[PDB]
Design an enzyme around this catalytic site. Structure first.
Site, PDB file in Angstrom:
ATOM      1  N   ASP A 183       9.356   3.121   0.952  1.00  0.00           N
ATOM      2  CA  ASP A 183       8.216   3.916   1.391  1.00  0.00           C
ATOM      3  C   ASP A 183       8.082   3.768   2.899  1.00  0.00           C
ATOM      4  O   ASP A 183       7.514   2.798   3.408  1.00  0.00           O
ATOM      5  CB  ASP A 183       6.937   3.495   0.654  1.00  0.00           C
ATOM      6  CG  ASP A 183       5.688   4.165   1.197  1.00  0.00           C
ATOM      7  OD1 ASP A 183       4.612   3.969   0.599  1.00  0.00           O
ATOM      8  OD2 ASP A 183       5.677   4.888   2.205  1.00  0.00           O
ATOM      9  N   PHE A 210       0.808  -1.180   0.000  1.00  0.00           N
ATOM     10  CA  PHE A 210       0.000   0.000   0.000  1.00  0.00           C
ATOM     11  C   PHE A 210       0.863   1.260   0.000  1.00  0.00           C
ATOM     12  O   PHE A 210       1.659   1.498   0.914  1.00  0.00           O
ATOM     13  CB  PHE A 210      -0.938  -0.008   1.180  1.00  0.00           C
ATOM     14  CG  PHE A 210      -1.955   1.062   1.096  1.00  0.00           C
ATOM     15  CD1 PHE A 210      -1.596   2.373   1.356  1.00  0.00           C
ATOM     16  CD2 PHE A 210      -3.242   0.780   0.681  1.00  0.00           C
ATOM     17  CE1 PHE A 210      -2.508   3.376   1.250  1.00  0.00           C
ATOM     18  CE2 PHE A 210      -4.172   1.783   0.575  1.00  0.00           C
ATOM     19  CZ  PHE A 210      -3.806   3.092   0.861  1.00  0.00           C
ATOM     20  N   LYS A 217       2.837  11.351   7.293  1.00  0.00           N
ATOM     21  CA  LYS A 217       2.144  10.918   8.507  1.00  0.00           C
ATOM     22  C   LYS A 217       2.766  11.489   9.767  1.00  0.00           C
ATOM     23  O   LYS A 217       2.591  12.663  10.071  1.00  0.00           O
ATOM     24  CB  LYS A 217       2.052   9.395   8.539  1.00  0.00           C
ATOM     25  CG  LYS A 217       0.990   8.957   7.571  1.00  0.00           C
ATOM     26  CD  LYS A 217       0.862   7.484   7.386  1.00  0.00           C
ATOM     27  CE  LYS A 217      -0.099   7.215   6.231  1.00  0.00           C
ATOM     28  NZ  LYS A 217      -0.413   5.777   6.112  1.00  0.00           N
ATOM     29  N   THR A 238       1.969  23.423  -6.224  1.00  0.00           N
ATOM     30  CA  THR A 238       1.680  24.751  -5.670  1.00  0.00           C
ATOM     31  C   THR A 238       2.329  24.965  -4.308  1.00  0.00           C
ATOM     32  O   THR A 238       3.138  25.877  -4.120  1.00  0.00           O
ATOM     33  CB  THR A 238       0.162  24.961  -5.532  1.00  0.00           C
ATOM     34  OG1 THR A 238      -0.441  25.010  -6.829  1.00  0.00           O
ATOM     35  CG2 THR A 238      -0.165  26.326  -4.920  1.00  0.00           C
TER      36      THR A 238
HETATM   37  C1  LIG Z   1      -1.854   5.577   6.339  1.00  0.00           C
HETATM   38  C2  LIG Z   1      -2.386   5.990   7.688  1.00  0.00           C
HETATM   39  C3  LIG Z   1      -2.649   5.200   5.342  1.00  0.00           C
HETATM   40  C4  LIG Z   1      -4.183   5.123   5.471  1.00  0.00           C
HETATM   41  C5  LIG Z   1      -4.812   3.975   4.681  1.00  0.00           C
HETATM   42  C6  LIG Z   1      -5.640   4.494   3.526  1.00  0.00           C
HETATM   43  O1  LIG Z   1      -5.329   5.538   2.904  1.00  0.00           O
HETATM   44  O2  LIG Z   1      -6.655   3.856   3.179  1.00  0.00           O
HETATM   45  N1  LIG Z   1      -2.009   4.853   4.072  1.00  0.00           N
HETATM   46  C7  LIG Z   1      -1.187   5.740   3.528  1.00  0.00           C
HETATM   47  C8  LIG Z   1       0.073   5.320   2.853  1.00  0.00           C
HETATM   48  C9  LIG Z   1       0.441   6.023   1.714  1.00  0.00           C
HETATM   49  C10 LIG Z   1      -0.422   7.170   1.236  1.00  0.00           C
HETATM   50  O3  LIG Z   1      -0.296   8.203   2.183  1.00  0.00           O
HETATM   51  P1  LIG Z   1      -1.417   9.323   2.365  1.00  0.00           P
HETATM   52  O4  LIG Z   1      -1.718   9.896   1.035  1.00  0.00           O
HETATM   53  O5  LIG Z   1      -2.701   8.668   2.911  1.00  0.00           O
HETATM   54  O6  LIG Z   1      -0.866  10.364   3.359  1.00  0.00           O
HETATM   55  C11 LIG Z   1       1.695   5.807   1.159  1.00  0.00           C
HETATM   56  N2  LIG Z   1       2.549   4.883   1.728  1.00  0.00           N
HETATM   57  C12 LIG Z   1       2.193   4.174   2.851  1.00  0.00           C
HETATM   58  C13 LIG Z   1       3.183   3.187   3.404  1.00  0.00           C
HETATM   59  C14 LIG Z   1       0.940   4.385   3.434  1.00  0.00           C
HETATM   60  O7  LIG Z   1       0.729   3.982   4.726  1.00  0.00           O
HETATM   61  C1  LIG Z   2      -1.635  26.483  -9.273  1.00  0.00           C
HETATM   62  C2  LIG Z   2      -1.025  27.591  -8.435  1.00  0.00           C
HETATM   63  C3  LIG Z   2      -0.909  25.582  -9.902  1.00  0.00           C
HETATM   64  C4  LIG Z   2       0.626  25.556  -9.858  1.00  0.00           C
HETATM   65  C5  LIG Z   2       1.242  25.112 -11.176  1.00  0.00           C
HETATM   66  C6  LIG Z   2       2.039  23.834 -11.018  1.00  0.00           C
HETATM   67  O1  LIG Z   2       1.814  22.976 -10.115  1.00  0.00           O
HETATM   68  O2  LIG Z   2       2.951  23.642 -11.851  1.00  0.00           O
HETATM   69  N1  LIG Z   2      -1.678  24.586 -10.639  1.00  0.00           N
HETATM   70  C7  LIG Z   2      -2.446  23.763  -9.911  1.00  0.00           C
HETATM   71  C8  LIG Z   2      -3.768  23.253 -10.362  1.00  0.00           C
HETATM   72  C9  LIG Z   2      -4.096  21.937 -10.106  1.00  0.00           C
HETATM   73  C10 LIG Z   2      -3.219  21.083  -9.212  1.00  0.00           C
HETATM   74  O3  LIG Z   2      -3.340  21.522  -7.873  1.00  0.00           O
HETATM   75  P1  LIG Z   2      -2.059  21.593  -6.916  1.00  0.00           P
HETATM   76  O4  LIG Z   2      -1.511  20.233  -6.735  1.00  0.00           O
HETATM   77  O5  LIG Z   2      -0.988  22.449  -7.605  1.00  0.00           O
HETATM   78  O6  LIG Z   2      -2.452  22.204  -5.563  1.00  0.00           O
HETATM   79  C11 LIG Z   2      -5.255  21.402 -10.653  1.00  0.00           C
HETATM   80  N2  LIG Z   2      -6.066  22.173 -11.454  1.00  0.00           N
HETATM   81  C12 LIG Z   2      -5.741  23.484 -11.720  1.00  0.00           C
HETATM   82  C13 LIG Z   2      -6.647  24.314 -12.589  1.00  0.00           C
HETATM   83  C14 LIG Z   2      -4.587  24.030 -11.172  1.00  0.00           C
HETATM   84  O7  LIG Z   2      -4.283  25.347 -11.409  1.00  0.00           O
END
Ligand SMILES: */C(C)=C(/CCC(=O)O)NCc1c(COP(=O)(O)O)cnc(C)c1O
Ligand SMILES: */C(C)=C(/CCC(=O)O)NCc1c(COP(=O)(O)O)cnc(C)c1O
Ligand code: FES
Lengths: 461, 461
Positions: free
Chosen positions: A288, A179, A319, A343
């Site tokens: 990870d 995961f 986390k 962003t």
């Molecule tokens: C950690 C508490 C979790 C929750 C289980 C779920 O999402 O259903 N998993 C997260 C996890 C990720 C993704 O992280 P995030 O986007 O939820 O912050 C990536 N890698 C590991 C090892 C995980 O535990």
């Molecule tokens: C907005 C300030 C941006 C930054 C440009 C970049 O990331 O290169 N674009 C973001 C944006 C997203 C993605 O959101 P986030 O991950 O950057 O917070 C999705 N859709 C639109 C229309 C955006 O402008």
């Protein structure tokens, strides 16, 4: 700051929680909600619910609370007038970092950097961490092949319209039971539970078996040796297979311990070999530590137990670390800006808190405590296993990162349910495992407190 | 609270910034960094750098600061002892929401809900909002086809190993010049700039042209009519093509205004028709208001200008809203928990702030102001365009969401560079466009402060 112990007033969820759950269920599917909390009245290891129940929390918001609730050091931070700006002026870190940005990084993340990884990029969460680590890996791999030369016009064109050669058909190799998040990229490398994956398009990337150790470990050395080797052999073939499918494996991602998939462990020897395999095939080795990272296994990063000077190429976290991100080797450093970018790229408010957490972890010797309290815990678990084989099996763990298996998901769920009403919060993982994720201020006297409560739950079960 | 005007002490970046950039560059590729800030001394529309420069900020952290820097209402929030917990006790919202979770949502996001969208899920950033919206869409589309039939065993199995039928080969249709984030899923629907996409595997999803208008609009009515129609026709074919490729288009994503791709506008009529097309083909219509959302165009959500009662099925936001997430129709509501889910699913600390921001926006009539100040701004722009056709063309906008084109990227970059040293921060987008993203406390006299600085610039350029 810590309460003395649990004190339940009601069944959980209580009526005040069930009303709240009722309301939230209009706005959204609220079914995953355990109960509603009162974080204001929570302190240390105790989570307090809205019905007044005070539970001993060994789940820690799915392993994301480093030093317990309402930690006084964190309170003091928020109370500083000088810190207000950090909390209300969120920068687009990629372009307009705050003045304190590097110092605070030095006070925090850089002070616990993994071996060999000079580079650090921040992210808001675990899924963007891994996603961007995937990207970093892909970029590095085309960089090997292209050399120190320019981008081709064909590539420049095809990439804008989702095509090769601009968009290469590279892959990241992942393990069953894994995961790594749920955004569409992470999700391809996740192999936890069908409900998480079903109906979502994916990537045709290689999936390899993760070792399934037979317990107790003393009795199964050979078998467990052979299982690991079989798995390792299966990884290697997979890489080869995909090199031939012209879906080259650019990187391998693995958890030091598989969490959501059911707290699956393997030997340090296993990981050490897996790291070599990766290297041998020019695969970036992505560890990870999103869930295992943060000291709970007795060392800041779980991979540290492996004892390698070059444990990995990329390491993701989130986390417990409050903020997301990933460390990595100089050689993985993006060649140009605006490739690995977004962003907010984290949040200085989290770094502020994180720097203090880390300080606490060091001043209060919490890594060691985790190890110690873990042992007590794991010892008790073993004792219960002996006394109740009809319910408990495969007791395992490292540090406080413990777990055991129950005969089925219903019993698993029942035990958790009982314990919660008795004043202890446990987590589940896989089909039938119960898991522990205590915050790092979980002393061994809480390990006893749990053991003495849960012991009596078993006699009555 | 807001300064009187800009006051530059040095060139930008200044020496103190260049030292900091030097340092941060060891740990990571720091090339995108404009300069280092002092958010503590920043105030309303003015961003203050570490060399003491005080600039009129019309870029607003790439459009993510709603009511300016160090807003006193936000200060007051952070000063409340009752709010400390929110800032230091981050919940796994999916399972252990705080007691105030729904009330605060009612005070914030739910109070600006789009028409027809009863459902709301929160996310940490814009990239995960769109990813999860994609997933929500895929999940919904599967349900249409499978009616009241349950999950199949084949599906349940194949999904765990990245295969059909478990993992359907569905697609999301996107537009050229688009930008929706950079995680691997969003990224497939982004079509902004080759550096953003290159070397990253992608999805074979349909890409459609986004109308490209000719200015001034008064003189190009027919052409601009025809261009839009051509585009609309191209979308429809694309959907059909992919239905036949057996890569069904489950949803369409579009920005009310394409931002990163170069502030590309289209008629409300265009979007109204696009919305029907989507509906006609059973495509979920996904509007990405991540950048356009938050009042800057004179209405809270840009799509509102389209005047439809059913403007969309899903709407994503982030940035200005402090938190990410997406609204959606009841019918898109996930059928079961743990499908659309992640650890933090937002952050109550952001909601706290957001609720106040929204209140300010309403009490201080900021939507209207945006419209008004926008007009002043856009008027001045038009005047400059008349006076300097050798530099300025295609002046456009809605609300303060304005922009113009310059002959090339070098001039574009030079003008921005000059303006910055003169005390105004502008943003660029596309190859050769300059863009405005003023916070919602930007007023008509701030537009005149800019217009005058930039007039003088254009003269001796
Ligand atoms: C950690 C508490 C979790 C929750 C289980 C779920 O999402 O259903 N998993 C997260 C996890 C990720 C993704 O992280 P995030 O986007 O939820 O912050 C990536 N890698 C590991 C090892 C995980 O535990
Ligand atoms: C907005 C300030 C941006 C930054 C440009 C970049 O990331 O290169 N674009 C973001 C944006 C997203 C993605 O959101 P986030 O991950 O950057 O917070 C999705 N859709 C639109 C229309 C955006 O402008
Ligand atoms: S996908 Fe990480 S905070 Fe959005």
């Amino acid at each position: 700051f810590d309460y003395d112990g649990p004190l339940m007033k009601t069944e959980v969820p209580g009526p005040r929680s069930r009303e709240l759950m009722k309301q939230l269920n209009i706005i959204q599917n609220a079914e995953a909600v355990h109960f509603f909390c009162n974080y204001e009245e929570s302190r240390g290891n105790y989570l307090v619910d809205v019905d007044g129940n005070r539970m001993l929390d060994l789940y820690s918001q799915i392993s994301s609370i480093p030093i317990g609730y309402s930690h006084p050091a964190l309170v003091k931070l928020v109370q500083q007038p000088q810190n207000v700006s950090t909390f209300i002026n969120r920068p687009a870190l990629g372009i307009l970092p705050p003045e304190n940005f590097v110092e605070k990084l030095r006070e925090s993340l850089l002070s616990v950097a993994p071996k060999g990884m000079s580079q650090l990029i921040t992210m808001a969460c675990g899924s963007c961490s891994n996603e961007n680590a995937f990207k970093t890996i892909f970029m590095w791999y085309r960089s090997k092949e292209r050399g120190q030369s320019a981008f081709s016009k064909e590539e420049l064109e095809t990439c804008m319209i989702n095509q090769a050669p601009g968009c290469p058909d590279y892959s990241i190799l992942s393990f069953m039971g894994a995961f790594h998040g749920r955004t569409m990229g992470c999700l391809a490398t996740t192999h936890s539970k069908a409900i998480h994956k079903i109906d979502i398009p994916s990537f045709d990337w290689p999936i390899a078996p993760f070792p399934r150790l037979k317990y107790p470990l003393e009795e199964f050395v050979k078998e467990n040796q052979q299982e690991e080797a079989r798995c390792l052999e299966e990884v290697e073939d997979l890489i080869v297979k995909y090199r031939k499918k012209k879906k080259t494996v650019a990187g391998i991602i693995v958890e030091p311990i598989q969490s959501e998939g059911g707290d699956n462990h393997a030997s340090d020897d296993f990981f050490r070999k897996l790291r070599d395999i990766s290297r041998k095939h020019g695969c970036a080795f992505l560890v990870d530590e999103v869930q295992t990272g943060g000291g709970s296994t007795g060392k800041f990063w779980a991979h540290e137990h492996w004892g390698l000077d070059d444990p990995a190429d990329v390491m993701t976290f989130s986390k417990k670390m409050m903020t997301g991100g990933f460390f990595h080797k100089e050689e993985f450093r993006p060649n140009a800006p605006y490739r690995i970018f977004n962003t907010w790229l984290g949040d200085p408010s989290k770094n502020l808190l994180l720097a203090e957490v880390i300080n606490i972890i060091k001043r209060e010797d919490l890594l060691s405590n985790a190890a110690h309290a873990g042992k007590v815990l794991l010892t008790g678990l073993l004792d219960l296993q002996a006394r109740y084989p009809q319910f408990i099996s495969r007791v395992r763990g490292r540090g406080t990162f413990c777990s055991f298996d129950t005969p089925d998901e219903s019993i698993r769920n029942k035990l958790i349910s009982i314990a919660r009403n008795k004043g202890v919060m446990l987590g589940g993982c896989g089909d039938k495992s119960i898991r522990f994720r205590p915050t790092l201020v979980f002393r061994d006297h809480h390990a006893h407190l749990f053991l003495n409560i849960f012991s009596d739950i078993l006699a009555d079960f």
